[PDB]
Amino acid sequence: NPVERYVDEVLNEVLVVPNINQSHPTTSNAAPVLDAAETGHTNKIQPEDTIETRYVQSSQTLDEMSVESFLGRSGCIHESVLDIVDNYNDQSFTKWNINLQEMAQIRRKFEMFTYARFDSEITMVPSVAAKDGHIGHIVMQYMYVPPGAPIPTTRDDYAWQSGTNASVFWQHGQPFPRFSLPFLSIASAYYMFYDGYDGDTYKSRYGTVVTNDMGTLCSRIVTSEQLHKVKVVTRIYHKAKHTKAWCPRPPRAVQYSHTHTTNYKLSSEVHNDVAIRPRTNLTTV
Amino acid sequence: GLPVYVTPGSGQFMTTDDMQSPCALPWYHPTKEIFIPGEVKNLIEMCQVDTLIPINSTQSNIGNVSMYTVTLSPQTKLAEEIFAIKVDIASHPLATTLIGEIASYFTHWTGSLRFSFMFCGTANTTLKVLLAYTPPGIGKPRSRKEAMLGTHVVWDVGLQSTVSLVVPWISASQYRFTTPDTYSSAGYITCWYQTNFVVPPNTPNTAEMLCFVSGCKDFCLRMARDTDLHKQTGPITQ
Amino acid sequence: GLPVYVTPGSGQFMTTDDMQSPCALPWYHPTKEIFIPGEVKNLIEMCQVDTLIPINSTQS
C-alpha cells in the first residue's frame, strides 16, 4: 500500500532487522563456528549458533544506513572569496573549477565507493563582511559555465549576459540560493577513482582529472563599485539526491593532499599519519 | 491571495532538510543507466564483510603488515594470555576496520559482533585456544579461569583454519555510544592457550594468526555524524 | 515547495482586516456561558427604543 509505505517512511521503519530466536544446547558434528577465511567469504554464523539465546523482537531499522541517507546530507565543497582591497574591477569577480575534491568530509564519504550516480542539490551561503562599515546593496551573480563556454575575463565581460548559461542572482537580505543539477556525466556514473590516462605517453595525465570535468563556476558582485570595501565569502554546499553507488572500498586512511589524486605524504613516524593509536602491547586494552 | 502565516524556521538553511528546488538545466536528459556489478544500497552490506583487525598495532609494528598478525608458539607456562582488546566497535584497535570506520560515522550502535581467527602455521602444527568475551561491570579477566567464566569458544586448530567467536549483544540499554563512553563500554575479548602450541621436529616454532571482525544479522548503526578518524588541517589543492 | 507570489498588501496591518491568528493559550477552555437576560445582537435594537431629546438645551 502506498499509504502503508508512507507510514513506514514517517516512522523510519522501512528496513527492519531480524529478530534473535531462542536457541538451545547442542552436541553435533556440524560445527558452524568453524570455517575457512581463505575462501574469501565471511562465516555466516549468528549468535543463536554459539550460545543459548532468548527470543528477542528487534525494533531497529536500517533506513538511516541507506546510501541515500549516508550521502544525502549537505556539506561544504567550496568557499569562494571576493575581497575588495584596492581594485574593484579586478577583485569583484572570480572563478572556480568545480569539483568535490577540496573538502575532506564529503570527499571521504563519496570515496567509500568506486562509482556513484546522483543528482545534486547546491545551496549557497553568502556572507558580506563590512570592512569599512557599510555593505550597501549587495547583489551577486553565480554563473555555471559548462566546459567550452566563454569564461569572463573582466567584471563587464559579455559572457555575464548569460544568454544560455544558467545564472543565479542573489540579493542581500533574501534567503539562501538553491538549485538542483541532474546527473551530469557523459558516462553512466561518476568515477570516484580512475586507474587510467588521457593518453599513452610519459606525459599523459592520470586519475579522475581525466574523467571528471564539471566546468566552471563564475561569480561577480553585480553591484557597481561602492565607497566602502567589502569581503564577500560564498560557501557552496552539496547534497546528493536519488543516489546509487557501486563497489565499496577502504576508507581514506591518511590526509588528502591534492585534488583528483590519491597521493599522500608520510612523516618519519608513520603512526602519526594514520588514525591508529599505538598499543602498549597485545594484552593492554 | 491566500492568507498565509510564515512559520519559524522559514528562510533558514538546515544541511539535513529535504526540500525541492528548481533545476538549473531544464529539459536535460541524463545518460542512460547501465548495469554495473557491485551495487550497494545500504552500508549494512559493508558491515557484514570481514576485514582485518590491526590487533598487533604496537608502535614498532604500525606501518608493517605485522601489525595485523599475532604470534603463537610453544609455551613453558600453562594458560598464558595471548591478546586482549575492548569489544567496543569504534574503539582501538577496532576503529580502523571497515565496520569500525562506518561505525565512526554514527553515534549509536547495537547488535552482535563476529570475531574470526585464521591460524597460519604449518599443516602439522596443532593448537587449542580459548577465546572469551567478558560482559561489562567487571575488569578484564586476569587469568584463563577468570575469562572462561564468561562467554567463550574453545578453538581446536585443524583442517578448517578459521574459527568464529560471537560477542552477543548483552547491554542494559538497547543501544550504546560508538565513541569511548564509560556507561556504555561493552566489555572485553581475550585469548588464552587452552592446551599448547605443538609441532613435530624440523617445523617452525612460531606461527601467525589473523583476526577479522564483522557484524551479525542484528548489527545496526544510528544517528549520522562526522568521523574523527580522518581530518583536514590545510587546503586540498590542485 | 509550492511556487507563490506575494501580493501587495502582504505584511500590512489593517485595523479592519479579518484574519486568523495563533492562540497564546492553547488547550484553554473558556468559562461555560450562562443565560443572562438582555442580550443585544444588533445596534438597531437600541435605535428602536425611545430616549428623551434635550430639546430645551439653552445655556441656562
Binding site: 502506498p2 499509504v3 508512507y6 538542483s180 536519488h242 543516489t243 | 529535504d18 525541492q20 528548481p22 | 509550492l2
Partner: peptide, 29 residues
Amino acid sequence: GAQVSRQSLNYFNINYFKDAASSGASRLD
C-alpha cells in the same frame, strides 16, 4: 505531480517542478 493515495489517510506525494532532479530524497529499497 500529485500521487494521491487512499486508505481515510490520503497521501499527497507532490512534485512542484518539472524535472526529476528537483524532487527530494528518494524512497528506500
